[PDB]
Design a protein around this motif. Structure first.
Motif, PDB file in Angstrom:
ATOM      1  N   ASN A   1       0.789  -1.221   0.000  1.00 56.88           N
ATOM      2  CA  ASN A   1       0.000   0.000   0.000  1.00 56.88           C
ATOM      3  C   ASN A   1       0.822   1.272   0.000  1.00 56.88           C
ATOM      4  O   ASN A   1       0.327   2.299  -0.470  1.00 56.88           O
ATOM      5  CB  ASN A   1      -0.942   0.049   1.209  1.00 56.88           C
ATOM      6  CG  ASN A   1      -0.216  -0.139   2.513  1.00 56.88           C
ATOM      7  OD1 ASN A   1       0.967  -0.471   2.539  1.00 56.88           O
ATOM      8  ND2 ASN A   1      -0.900   0.137   3.608  1.00 56.88           N
TER       9      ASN A   1
ATOM     10  N   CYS B   1       2.158   7.190 -10.586  1.00 57.41           N
ATOM     11  CA  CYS B   1       1.787   6.065  -9.759  1.00 57.41           C
ATOM     12  C   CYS B   1       0.455   6.372  -9.108  1.00 57.41           C
ATOM     13  O   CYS B   1       0.232   7.490  -8.643  1.00 57.41           O
ATOM     14  CB  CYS B   1       2.844   5.783  -8.694  1.00 57.41           C
ATOM     15  SG  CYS B   1       2.412   4.385  -7.676  1.00 57.41           S
TER      16      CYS B   1
ATOM     17  N   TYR C   1       4.249   3.487  -0.997  1.00 54.71           N
ATOM     18  CA  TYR C   1       5.473   3.729  -1.735  1.00 54.71           C
ATOM     19  C   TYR C   1       6.196   4.917  -1.123  1.00 54.71           C
ATOM     20  O   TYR C   1       5.762   5.489  -0.125  1.00 54.71           O
ATOM     21  CB  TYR C   1       5.187   3.988  -3.213  1.00 54.71           C
ATOM     22  CG  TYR C   1       4.970   2.744  -4.021  1.00 54.71           C
ATOM     23  CD1 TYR C   1       5.397   1.517  -3.560  1.00 54.71           C
ATOM     24  CD2 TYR C   1       4.345   2.797  -5.252  1.00 54.71           C
ATOM     25  CE1 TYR C   1       5.207   0.380  -4.295  1.00 54.71           C
ATOM     26  CE2 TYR C   1       4.145   1.655  -6.001  1.00 54.71           C
ATOM     27  CZ  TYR C   1       4.583   0.448  -5.512  1.00 54.71           C
ATOM     28  OH  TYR C   1       4.400  -0.705  -6.235  1.00 54.71           O
TER      29      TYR C   1
ATOM     30  N   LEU D   1      -3.685  -0.986  -6.865  1.00 56.66           N
ATOM     31  CA  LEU D   1      -2.382  -0.345  -6.958  1.00 56.66           C
ATOM     32  C   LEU D   1      -1.900  -0.365  -8.400  1.00 56.66           C
ATOM     33  O   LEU D   1      -1.886  -1.420  -9.040  1.00 56.66           O
ATOM     34  CB  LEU D   1      -1.369  -1.044  -6.059  1.00 56.66           C
ATOM     35  CG  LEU D   1       0.048  -0.496  -6.198  1.00 56.66           C
ATOM     36  CD1 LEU D   1       0.106   0.980  -5.847  1.00 56.66           C
ATOM     37  CD2 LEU D   1       0.992  -1.296  -5.329  1.00 56.66           C
TER      38      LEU D   1
ATOM     39  N   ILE E   1      -2.252   5.030  -6.203  1.00 57.77           N
ATOM     40  CA  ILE E   1      -2.572   4.194  -5.056  1.00 57.77           C
ATOM     41  C   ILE E   1      -4.025   4.435  -4.691  1.00 57.77           C
ATOM     42  O   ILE E   1      -4.409   5.565  -4.371  1.00 57.77           O
ATOM     43  CB  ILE E   1      -1.667   4.499  -3.850  1.00 57.77           C
ATOM     44  CG1 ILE E   1      -0.203   4.257  -4.203  1.00 57.77           C
ATOM     45  CG2 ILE E   1      -2.070   3.637  -2.671  1.00 57.77           C
ATOM     46  CD1 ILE E   1       0.764   4.724  -3.139  1.00 57.77           C
TER      47      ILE E   1
END
Lengths: 204, 220, 122, 228, 240, 191, 240, 232
Positions: B40, B176, B42, B183, B178
């Motif tokens: 979860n 990215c 980064y 993900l 989330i």
């Protein structure tokens, strides 16, 4: 600088299914060379070399320490090393002296142990790994080899044109450089064989 | 190097630019500064690259350890506490400009970390050398609880303004996503800068170089 | 470390380990040595090899310097360690004082080391 | 193992200290005699073999230019104590430009005569006879493994010490002379030894204020023996 | 029988006899009692002269650890001296690290854990002491705690440590303890000490009375017992 | 930057700007400069950021541990002593503008201040931070002994208003806090 | 099957046993104490009696319910010194959790850590292995209320109907006979079953002045100690 | 502590180490278990009976991963098992710190066997009465490694440890073979577990971990009651 105390330059170039690495032959103090036969490229297992440029003290030191840890690994585990594992090991050993740092820029050149996949990477003086697909360089002269390799590189190259490209690149970039010269050794390897050639460089 | 973060209506969209410069020369055109921590969480880094990498790998190992000791999903504030305690232990020596992001049981939580250890909970941050361009784009065009493509377009446009500013990257700007269940991770997002083809070329030949000593060694 | 004495006195004033540990030497190989007026001569007996094997590494006589000569009996491994310790010691004597090592100095070292080695804890 | 190193008696003192006092008895005897002219000292070497070279076995050692010694029983522990006593007297010289007096010498030794400890090794097995010439003239000092330090006027130690002290109390008084005390000591020596008295059995060690150096007699002791 | 030697071993029924042997050690020592009133705590020790060799004012078992806390020890004396020094050390730490007076609960917890650590291992023996802890605060009132040789520590109104442990609290409990000020409790402690063991096994005893509370404004000191002389002119009336 | 803590009859009143700056660039536009430690005891920080954060976290650790071992509500002077010890013992490195405030059941509202030196004193009002000097210029002018709660709110409002207006580093947004016997009542003024 | 020194230290006997830890499982039994834990629904109830024969002994200082953290309560049996020392270790490790990890400790992880510490005191010999039993309670998000037990062996478990001490073979037999019916547990069902199971084991049917009741519920997740009045209210509510 | 630091393990006149042999006997007096290496995966299975009907089965978990592809069970005592588990956790995480690649099972067993051998040799502490069954699918080929309180280790196609382990081993040697799949390995594992377990075997009496080449997987009692619903 401190990197420009003894000179030094290492070029590596990725080919099609093969990999080529080369370095210089000059050794000496700041203005006075000593000899033409100093080793900067070291065999680490089969079909896989490493190059060190900068202060030759850290070159011989880190070469012995990495050979130490490498033989410990290959005797604790019977297989041979994968190149990412070697890169992490070099990063760890360089990062151990965070404030006592070695003065070198390692370049790892190797093939895949299972397939014929080539591998090139370079690291910094504290251990920053950096993987590419074209070429990595190190040492005193930088922009010379950067301009030459960005001028001459093609993605899919037979070992002959790979050899001639890396030959012309090293010759012209070293001949433009002052403190680094006095002959070039060339290692061209592949899955089948290992070839080591020395070039007739300008002795000036 | 320009990383930035944002929190949309569900989760966190992160962005970065992957020019790894060494001094005055472009040394890399693709360097993943978006790092793994957890399923979860980064983290993104700036400044000294090797220090950020070793730090984020150490904290990722520690959080894998703590989560597998626990047996459930980690929390973002635990990573925040570990990072701030470590970077304050090193007394500001280690340069680590970090942006931390994940979605917990509580939801999305975004943090900025300055290398002395000062931490901030913010809906949007920018870190890095050309971070001011992305902070311009955010403070121009932010509104609370945006949608997905709105936030993705905003962060991409922010790092795009950073790359049209100095010290951006040649790369196809990394993003990215989330969310609470999904993900995502996108390296080749958008290429504005196509390589101009050589109309050359700088040719050679198989034997235009003098050879002094050749050697043959067979293998298996 | 070990807070235990091996060296406890007897009810009649003796040592249970020292003179009694001399018996392990007394149950060992024999070796003699004399001094002439110029030439010294010594040697060990009882090779007791398997008549088809090697014995150049089982040699019980060595040297520490080019001027002193060694011999022992008893169990061999203690002699091995004491010989290595005495090699390092006579070389360290060679480091400080630039004489050849006198025999009395190195015997004082070996005897004092074995003495305090018995004197220590366990 | 039968009430070891750190347990008292229900009636008296420790076991191992008593055992140290018993372990003195196996040693060779030695006799020192204080005289105001100077301190003389004697010992029996107890030589077994013709290979046993006589001048190598030490009983009288040389602490300083005016401090002699005599040992008992155990040898190498005594040598360790002698070495460190020389070290501590040398420290006193280094730090005061003078001579550490013999009482202070024996107190520096008896600071760790009983510091035997294996935790937080063993007690030592030597009774020492100390002679010296301080500012107060000659001195004769006797210690023990138990550290109970006392001055003795003429002490005998080791084996046969009962009859030695008895026959010494028969002959001693305060106003003695040097050579009289020497020959009176060696008479008791050849009364307590088992071999014929000759040059290689015993040795003498004599210190005077005017004769501080060379606390020894070398081969004139044969003349001293033949005058009995 | 074979298991009572070490302080680390258990028994085949599950208790430690070393702790029990330490507990009944203090039983042969002198009698030491304590009781609080509504604005203070009073201590009391039946203390004995050996025969004629003492000085009536040596070696007082009534300690004084903090400005408002002191001990009322009984058992082996030197161990109590050492443990009192540890208590002084802990109060010094608390005053240095927090700048105000130590509450008696946390102090008793630290002392109980210290005694517990000396009851755990095999290297040391458990303590052969049993003492009292009394104090006063303006925001807490009067507190009286109690520590066995094992290390169990909680609170009483009254206690007794010595021979007459039951035989003192037989009639300590019939005292109207809440509604009395401690100045009455002075002669109360005097009569409780005086009733037990006047002349039967020994010849003479002697009384000390430690004293803390609101009347001393939080100070802890022995009474001026000679001032108001409360025992003897009541003891001669408490024999009939 | 500019922090301020004022006591009254019932409790205390705190206050700060937000605007954590670095050089001439503002890193964070809105910031919790005041931090809870216990449920009744706050502190507001200045000087360096991470240093005071670590100090507040360690004080939170020791103080919550101590308060649970007491099984009682803790004192404000206790936390003031803890800040004094942790500031002074290893000072040399840190830049703390710590002001300790909070209502107490034994002792009402109290306000302590710990400046960069490491000393400790109890006051009825406090300033702190680089942009505190101006409203420190008139906090001894406008204050009157024996205020009410709303008077303290308006008092700190005008104070932090002019501090945020005049000082270059100060500005941003107004954060207030009301701690009394009753409850913790936090509010944010803006515009 | 005594071979060598198995009767004294922590070594292995013949056939697989070791005697010291199974000597320590009846070290709880000399406490003379009974504790019952109940988790049937989103509340959690502890009940444990006292035994005070004295009028001079207090009552606030005798309670075994030990509030570890604001949302974690526990109860102790066995000897008091090991219990309180385990309590300070638990409080200290909970504070370590909250500082290092940034949030409130789960009750499972804490019992795991105490089990590990009990192994630490179990592994090396010459160490007295703390003969006390700890039962924990707490509320978890996404899991509700929790009950855990710490053994002196460091063998933890966690389960609904929980009781350890002196008389709990019989109490667990009654809890097998009682938690088999699938009715709900609407918090007075829980309190009433705790009181009646303890009042069938001891069969005393006594005042609300002997038992202490600790509760935590998912309506106020703070740990809570009941008052004499509402304890009496529950007792007369189960009085038919 | 004092740190007396002498080991209680000394040799017999026979040449045996009776504390280690007693520890092995204490292992053999423990709970049964079974582990089988199949052609694609490795299946571990334990036998988990509660003492009473009061106990919950979501708190303590026998099958325990050490990484995302490494399973590990035991036959012995939990309070030692968790200590050696946590040690192996920290150890494998240190390996991943150094090399930035998941640790191979041979290296796990090398380092854990070295640690456990150190505990056999060191002063005054007992050995751990836990026999491990370690496995993982490393570089295509999976593995299966069994260790012991003596610090040694082995490698098995299949084995069993606990009560009646010789009976289960004789059944595994007959019934199992070299080549099966994961589900058939689960089936014969349940069969050899049901040979020696109690009569009432449910979704909670067993707890089963598998090791895919995609990674470790710990099964749920949902799929267990799907599979063990009168499996043959």
């Amino acid at each position: 600088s401190i990197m420009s105390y003894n000179g030094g330059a290492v070029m590596a170039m990725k080919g099609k299914n093969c990999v080529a690495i080369a370095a210089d032959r000059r050794f000496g103090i700041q203005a006075q060379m000593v000899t033409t036969d100093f080793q900067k490229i070291f065999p680490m297992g089969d079909r896989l070399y490493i190059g060190l440029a900068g202060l030759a003290t850290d070159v011989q030191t880190v070469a012995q320490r990495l050979k130490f840890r490498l033989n410990l690994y290959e005797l604790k585990e019977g297989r041979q090393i994968k190149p990412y594992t070697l890169m992490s090991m070099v990063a760890n050993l360089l990062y151990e002296k965070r404030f006592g740092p070695y003065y070198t820029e390692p370049v790892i050149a190797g093939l895949d142990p299972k397939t014929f996949k080539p591998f090139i990477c370079s690291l910094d003086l504290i251990g920053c790994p950096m993987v590419t697909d074209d070429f990595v360089v190190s040492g005193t002269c930088a922009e010379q080899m950067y301009g030459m390799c960005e001028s001459l590189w093609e993605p899919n190259m037979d070992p002959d044109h790979l050899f001639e490209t890396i030959s012309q690149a090293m010759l012209n970039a070293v001949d433009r450089d002052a403190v680094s010269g006095m002959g070039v050794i060339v290692h061209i390897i592949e899955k089948d064989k290992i070839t080591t050639r020395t070039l007739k460089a300008r002795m000036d | 190097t320009t990383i930035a973060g944002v929190v949309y209506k569900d989760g966190i969209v992160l962005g970065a630019d992957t020019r790894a410069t060494e001094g005055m020369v472009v040394a890399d055109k693709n360097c993943s500064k978006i790092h793994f921590i957890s399923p979860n969480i980064y983290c993104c880094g700036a400044g000294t690259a090797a220090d950020t990498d070793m730090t984020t790998q150490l904290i990722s190992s520690n959080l894998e350890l703590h989560s597998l000791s626990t047996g459930r999903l980690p929390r973002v504030v635990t990573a925040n506490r570990m990072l701030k305690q470590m970077l304050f232990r090193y007394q500001g020596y280690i340069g680590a400009a970090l942006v931390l992001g994940g979605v917990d049981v509580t939801g999305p939580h975004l943090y900025s970390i300055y290398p002395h250890g000062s931490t901030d909970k913010l809906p949007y941050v920018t870190m890095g050398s050309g971070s001011l361009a992305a902070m311009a784009v955010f403070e121009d065009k932010f509104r609370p609880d945006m949608e997905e493509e709105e936030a993705k377009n905003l962060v991409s446009e922010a790092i795009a303004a950073g790359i049209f500013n100095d010290l951006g990257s040649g790369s196809n700007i990394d993003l990215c996503v989330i969310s609470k269940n999904k993900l995502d991770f996108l390296r080749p997002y958008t290429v504005p800068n196509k390589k101009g083809t050589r109309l050359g070329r700088y040719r050679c030949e198989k034997g235009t170089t003098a050879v002094l000593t050749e050697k043959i060694t067979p293998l298996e | 470390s070990y807070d235990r004495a091996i060296t406890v006195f007897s009810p009649d004033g003796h040592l249970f380990q020292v003179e009694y540990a001399q018996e392990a030497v007394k149950k060992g190989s024999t070796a003699v040595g004399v001094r002439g007026r110029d030439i010294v001569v010594l040697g060990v007996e009882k090779k007791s090899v398997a008549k088809l094997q090697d014995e150049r590494t089982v040699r019980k006589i060595c040297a520490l310097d080019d001027n002193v000569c060694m011999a022992f009996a008893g169990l061999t491994a203690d002699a091995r360690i004491v010989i290595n310790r005495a090699r390092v010691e006579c070389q360290s004597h060679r480091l400080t004082v630039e004489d050849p090592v006198t025999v009395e100095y190195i015997t004082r070292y070996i005897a004092s080391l074995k003495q305090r080695y018995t004197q220590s804890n366990g | 193992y039968d009430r070891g190193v750190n347990t008292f008696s229900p009636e008296g003192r420790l076991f191992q200290v008593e055992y140290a006092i018993e372990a003195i008895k196996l040693g060779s005897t030695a006799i020192g005699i204080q005289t105001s002219e100077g301190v003389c000292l004697a010992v029996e070497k107890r030589i077994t073999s013709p290979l046993m070279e006589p001048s190598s076995i030490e009983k009288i050692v040389e602490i300083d230019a005016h401090i002699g010694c005599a040992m008992s029983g155990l040898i190498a522990d005594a040598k360790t104590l002698i070495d460190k006593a020389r070290v501590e007297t040398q420290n006193h010289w280094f730090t005061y430009n003078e001579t550490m007096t013999v009482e202070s010498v024996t107190q520096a030794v008896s600071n760790l005569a009983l510091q035997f400890g294996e935790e937080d090794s063993r007690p030592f097995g030597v009774a020492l006879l100390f002679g010296g010439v301080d500012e107060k003239g000659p001195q004769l000092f006797h210690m023990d493994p138990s550290g109970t330090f006392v001055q003795c006027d003429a002490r005998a130690i080791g084996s046969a010490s009962e009859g030695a002290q008895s026959s010494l109390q028969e002959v001693y008084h305060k106003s003695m002379t040097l050579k009289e005390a020497i020959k009176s000591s060696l008479i008791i020596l050849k009364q307590v030894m088992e071999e014929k008295l000759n040059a290689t059995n015993i040795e003498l060690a004599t210190v005077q204020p005017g004769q501080n150096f060379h606390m020894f007699t070398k081969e004139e002791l044969e003349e001293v023996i033949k005058d009995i | 029988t074979g298991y009572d030697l070490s302080a680390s071993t258990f028994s085949p029924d599950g208790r430690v006899f070393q702790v029990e042997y330490a507990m009944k050690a203090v039983e042969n020592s002198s009698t030491a009692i304590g009781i609080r009133c509504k604005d203070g705590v009073v201590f009391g020790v039946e203390k004995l002269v050996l025969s004629k060799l003492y000085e009536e004012g040596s070696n007082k078992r009534l300690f004084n650890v903090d400005r408002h806390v002191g001990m009322a020890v009984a058992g082996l004396l030197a161990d109590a001296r050492s443990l009192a020094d540890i208590a002084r050390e802990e109060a010094s730490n608390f005053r240095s690290n927090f700048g105000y007076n130590i509450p008696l609960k946390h102090l008793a917890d630290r002392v109980a854990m210290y005694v517990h650590a000396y009851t755990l291992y095999s290297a040391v023996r458990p303590f052969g002491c049993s003492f009292m802890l009394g104090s006063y605060s303006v925001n807490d009132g009067a507190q009286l705690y109690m520590i066995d040789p094992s290390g169990v520590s909680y609170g009483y109104w009254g206690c007794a440590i010595g021979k007459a442990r039951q035989a003192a609290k037989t009639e300590i409990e019939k005292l109207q303890m809440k509604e009395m000020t401690c100045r009455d409790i002075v002669k109360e402690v005097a009569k409780i000490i005086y009733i037990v063991h006047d002349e039967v096994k020994d010849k003479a005893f002697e009384l000390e009375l430690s004293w803390v509370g609101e009347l001393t404004n939080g100070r802890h000191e022995i009474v001026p017992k000679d001032i108001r002389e409360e025992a003897e002119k009541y003891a001669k009336e408490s024999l009939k | 930057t500019t922090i301020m803590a004022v006591q009254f009859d019932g409790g205390v009143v705190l206050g700060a700007d937000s605007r954590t700056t670095t050089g001439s660039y503002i890193a964070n536009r809105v910031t919790d400069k005041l931090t809870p430690i216990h449920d009744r005891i706050f502190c507001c920080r200045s000087g360096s950021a991470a240093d005071t954060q670590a100090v507040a976290d360690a004080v939170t650790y020791q103080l919550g541990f101590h308060s649970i071992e007491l099984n009682e509500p803790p004192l404000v002077h206790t936390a003031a002593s803890l800040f004094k010890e942790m500031c002074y013992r290893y000072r040399e490195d840190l830049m703390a503008g710590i002001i300790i405030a909070g209502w107490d059941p034994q002792e009402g509202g109290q306000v302590y201040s710990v400046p960069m030196g490491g000393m400790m004193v109890r006051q009825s009002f406090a300033i702190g931070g680089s942009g505190s000097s101006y409203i420190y210029g008139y906090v001894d002018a406008t204050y009157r002994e024996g205020m009410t709660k709303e008077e303290c709110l308006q008092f700190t409002a005008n104070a932090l208003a002019l501090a945020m207006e005049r000082d270059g580093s100060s500005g941003g947004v107004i954060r207030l806090a009301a701690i009394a016997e009753s409850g913790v009542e936090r509010q944010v003024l803006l515009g | 099957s005594s071979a060598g020194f198995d009767r004294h230290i922590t070594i292995f006997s013949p056939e697989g046993r070791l005697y010291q830890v199974e000597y320590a499982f009846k070290a709880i039994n000399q406490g003379g104490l009974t504790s019952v834990a109940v988790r049937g629904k989103d509340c959690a109830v502890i009940v444990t009696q006292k035994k005070v024969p004295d009028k001079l002994l207090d009552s606030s200082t005798v309670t075994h319910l030990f509030k570890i953290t604001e949302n974690i309560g526990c109860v102790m049996t066995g000897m008091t010194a090991d219990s309180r020392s385990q309590v300070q270790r638990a409080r200290y490790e909970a504070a370590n959790w909250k500082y290092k990890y940034g949030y409130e400790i789960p009750v499972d992880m804490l019992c795991k850590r105490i089990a590990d510490i009990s192994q630490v005191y179990t592994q090396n010999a010459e160490m007295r292995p703390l003969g006390c039993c700890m039962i924990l309670i707490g509320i978890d998000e996404e899991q509700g209320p929790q009950v855990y037990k710490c053994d002196p062996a460091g063998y933890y478990c966690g389960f609904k109907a929980t009781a350890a001490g002196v008389k709990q073979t019989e109490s667990t037999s009654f809890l097998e006979k009682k938690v088999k019916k699938k009715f709900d547990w609407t918090f007075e069902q829980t309190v009433e079953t705790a009181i009646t199971c303890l009042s069938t084991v001891l069969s005393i049917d006594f005042k609300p002045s002997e038992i202490e009741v600790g509760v935590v519920t998912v309506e106020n997740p703070k740990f809570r100690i009941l008052t004499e009045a509402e304890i009496d209210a529950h007792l007369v509510a189960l009085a038919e | 502590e004092r740190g007396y630091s002498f080991s209680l393990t000394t040799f017999s006149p026979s040449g045996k180490l009776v504390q280690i042999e007693y520890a092995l006997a204490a292992v053999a007096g423990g709970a049964p278990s079974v582990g089988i290496k199949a052609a694609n995966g490795v299946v571990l299975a334990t036998e988990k009976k509660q003492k009473s009907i009061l106990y919950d089965e979501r708190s303590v978990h026998k099958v325990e991963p050490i990484t995302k592809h490494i399973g590990l069970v035991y036959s012995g005592m939990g309070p030692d098992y968790r200590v050696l588990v946590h040690r192996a956790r920290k150890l494998a995480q240190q390996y991943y710190l150094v090399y930035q690649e998941p640790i191979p099972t041979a290296q796990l067993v090398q380092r854990v066997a070295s640690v456990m051998q150190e505990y056999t040799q060191s002063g005054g502490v007992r050995p751990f009465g836990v026999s491990l069954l370690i496995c993982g699918w490393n570089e295509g080929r999976p593995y299966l490694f069994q260790s012991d309180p003596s610090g040694a280790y082995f490698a098995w196609k299949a084995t069993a440890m606990g009560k009646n382990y010789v009976n289960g081993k004789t059944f595994l040697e007959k019934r199992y073979n070299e080549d099966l799949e994961l589900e058939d390995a689960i089936h014969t594992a349940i069969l050899t577990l049901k040979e020696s377990f109690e009569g009432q075997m449910t979704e909670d009496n067993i707890e089963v971990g598998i090791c895919n080449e995609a990674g470790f997987r710990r099964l749920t009692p949902t799929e267990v009651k799907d599979y063990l619903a009168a499996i043959a």
